[PDB]
Amino acid sequence: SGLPKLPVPPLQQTLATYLQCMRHLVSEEQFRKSQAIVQQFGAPGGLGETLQQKLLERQEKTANWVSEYWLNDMYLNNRLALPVNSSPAVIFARQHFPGTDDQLRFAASLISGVLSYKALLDSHSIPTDCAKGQLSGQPLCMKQYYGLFSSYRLPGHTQDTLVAQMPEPEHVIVACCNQFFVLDVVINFRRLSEGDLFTQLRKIVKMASNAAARLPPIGLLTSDGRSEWAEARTVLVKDSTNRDSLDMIERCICLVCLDAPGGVELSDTHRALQLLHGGGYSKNGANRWYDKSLQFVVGRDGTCGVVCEHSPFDGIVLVQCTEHLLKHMTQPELVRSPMVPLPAPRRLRWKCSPEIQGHLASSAEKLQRIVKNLDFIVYKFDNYGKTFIKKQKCSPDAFIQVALQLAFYRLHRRLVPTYESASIRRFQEGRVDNIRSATPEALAFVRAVTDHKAAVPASEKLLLLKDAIRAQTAYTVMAITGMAIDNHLLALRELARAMCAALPEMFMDETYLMSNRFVLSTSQVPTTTEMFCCYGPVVPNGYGACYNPQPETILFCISSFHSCAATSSSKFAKAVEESLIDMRDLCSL
Numbered sequence: 001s002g003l004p005k006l007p008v009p010p011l012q013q014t015l016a017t018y019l020q021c022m023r024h025l026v027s028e029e030q031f032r033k034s035q036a037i038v039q040q041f042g043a044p045g046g047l048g049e050t051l052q053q054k055l056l057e058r059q060e061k062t063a064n065w066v067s068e069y070w071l072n073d074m075y076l077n078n079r080l081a082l083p084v085n086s087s088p089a090v091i092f093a094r095q096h097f098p099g100t101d102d103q104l105r106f107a108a109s110l111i112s113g114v115l116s117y118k119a120l121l122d123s124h125s126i127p128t129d130c131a132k133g134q135l136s137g138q139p140l141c142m143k144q145y146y147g148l149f150s151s152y153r154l155p156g157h158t159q160d161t162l163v164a165q166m167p168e169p170e171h172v173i174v175a176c177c178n179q180f181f182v183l184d185v186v187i188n189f190r191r192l193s194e195g196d197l198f199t200q201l202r203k204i205v206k207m208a209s210n211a212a213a214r215l216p217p218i219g220l221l222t223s224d225g226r227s228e229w230a231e232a233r234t235v236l237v238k239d240s241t242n243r244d245s246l247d248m249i250e251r252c253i254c255l256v257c258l259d260a261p262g263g264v265e266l267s268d269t270h271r272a273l274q275l276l277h278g279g280g281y282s283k284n285g286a287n288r289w290y291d292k293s294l295q296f297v298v299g300r301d302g303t304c305g306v307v308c309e310h311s312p313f314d315g316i317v318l319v320q321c322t323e324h325l326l327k328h329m330t331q332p333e334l335v336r337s338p339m340v341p342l343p344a345p346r347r348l349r350w351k352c353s354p355e356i357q358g359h360l361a362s363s364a365e366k367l368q369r370i371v372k373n374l375d376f377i378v379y380k381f382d383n384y385g386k387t388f389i390k391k392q393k394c395s396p397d398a399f400i401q402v403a404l405q406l407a408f409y410r411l412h413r414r415l416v417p418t419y420e421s422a423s424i425r426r427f428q429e430g431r432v433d434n435i436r437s438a439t440p441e442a443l444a445f446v447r448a449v450t451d452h453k454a455a456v457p458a459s460e461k462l463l464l465l466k467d468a469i470r471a472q473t474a475y476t477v478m479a480i481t482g483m484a485i486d487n488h489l490l491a492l493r494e495l496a497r498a499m500c501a502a503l504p505e506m507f508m509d510e511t512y513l514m515s516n517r518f519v520l521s522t523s524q525v526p527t528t529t530e531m532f533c534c535y536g537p538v539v540p541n542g543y544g545a546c547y548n549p550q551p552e553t554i555l556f557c558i559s560s561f562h563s564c565a566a567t568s569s570s571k572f573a574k575a576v577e578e579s580l581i582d583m584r585d586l587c588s589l
Ligand SMILES: CC(C)(COP(=O)(O)OP(=O)(O)OC[C@H]1O[C@@H](n2cnc3c(N)ncnc32)[C@H](O)[C@@H]1OP(=O)(O)O)[C@@H](O)C(=O)NCCC(=O)NCCS
Pocket: 132, 133, 134, 314, 315, 316, 390, 391, 392, 393, 394, 395, 396, 397, 398, 421, 422, 423, 424, 432, 476, 480, 523, 524, 525
């Protein structure tokens, strides 16, 4: 590759930044202790320098010194069930399917789109991406695109495994009524016609309606905790017939889920709930297989989108792919490719036992908990967007990040360690690092705005606001150029772990542990289309906030858990609105 390698920030720089990031987020006493702990860790000839040298050696010996640690720490090691906790969802615009054939026509076209997109990929014909927004123009890593259809996430007892692929024939798994069918799409590079795909889908729907053939909803098992699924899967593996079906799923291109009519109204919020967890076993919750990277949902009632397994790639790459797919569906149906004789799709067989029956019950129950615990809302701020923000000589993203801090503070009376996905695709195999938005400058601003007794003059609030945005931007530039701290500290941490299972004080420190519990987890997932991305929180008492800034509006997808009496997605969305209004008034002085 011609891309530069992810940089290794200097040790002292990361340590200084770290302490500064956390001083206002911990007690004075605790900070003093951390100061001393860090001083000792990074002292000349100390442990810090020994680990740093080992990191430089690792940087030289690998293409990306953090890929492995990051992949495990961020996803594979996580034991939580994938739905809501990990797998984000992208919702397409509302569709209208008068008859079942309309649904199947859409699905056929979509599958065709997928096939031509994958052809462009297999031929390395996809135009190399370039940075836009902050520091734009340089080439970006394209590795993520190659993980779109060739990946499967295997459950494990303690750590999962991301399997990187091509089966011939090449096929897609179609799920209907919780039944999984193998739909071959490419014989000898012969790509079935959009007309033949329609015909095959009609057959699938028909078979998926046969009572005497209906099999147990095995898909449900993949919606459980990772350790739980790993165990139920071990039970399944005992039988040869199940071993075959799993493999088929494991080697498919993707899944195409023909969801049953949802029960509630088709609002952006409800359509997203369906994409996130399917609404539980009583709805479309089992018509899935979360281990597979991409699950395209085409429901009978018009609810469409794609459920994504996070570990193999991030939302930007995903959105580019989907927007291309949808654009391809806007583009005219080509000439035909006709298949005579056209074999019938194969239904994956499962040999269930009393054991598996119990596992299905548990998973059904576990999933229901996720469904009722998710507090989600799609909020569209329409007073203004990027256009107005740019007129304030401000970075939209930074401005929005600051708005979220103010919303959080005005509602809960404190700032908390916050996470914002910062793409580092400027470097080989680059995924993301973290932008810590809960800066000291943000604190000074939110306090001025909310502390009535201080009576801070509006002119001063404006100054603090601009400084907060300046600091947000500075950290953003720092992160996207690989000079931030999270990935750096992670590497040092795991390198030490290799030396001795007993981590240094540095990483046992309550300050470090606290710095990584992201009560406010966020990310910008911009899209030109009518679509939007959403996901749940990463901690029991936290929020998930994915926004899409447009010229005149800003879409906010807010999530939290009903279990935490302290959080509330409706209240937070309201606080976001008020925060944006307040900031607007401040800039209009
Ligand atoms: C960190 C990050 C979010 C910053 O986003 P960004 O796109 O640079 O956003 P900004 O808010 O700075 O906005 C960029 C736009 O505002 C403009 N802008 C930025 N600062 C400005 C300023 N001070 N004054 C006026 N305009 C400004 C830019 O010129 C650009 O305008 P353009 O639409 O004509 O190109 C981005 O670099 C990133 O990493 N995005 C990836 C998110 C991701 O990974 N999502 C999936 C997670 S799994």
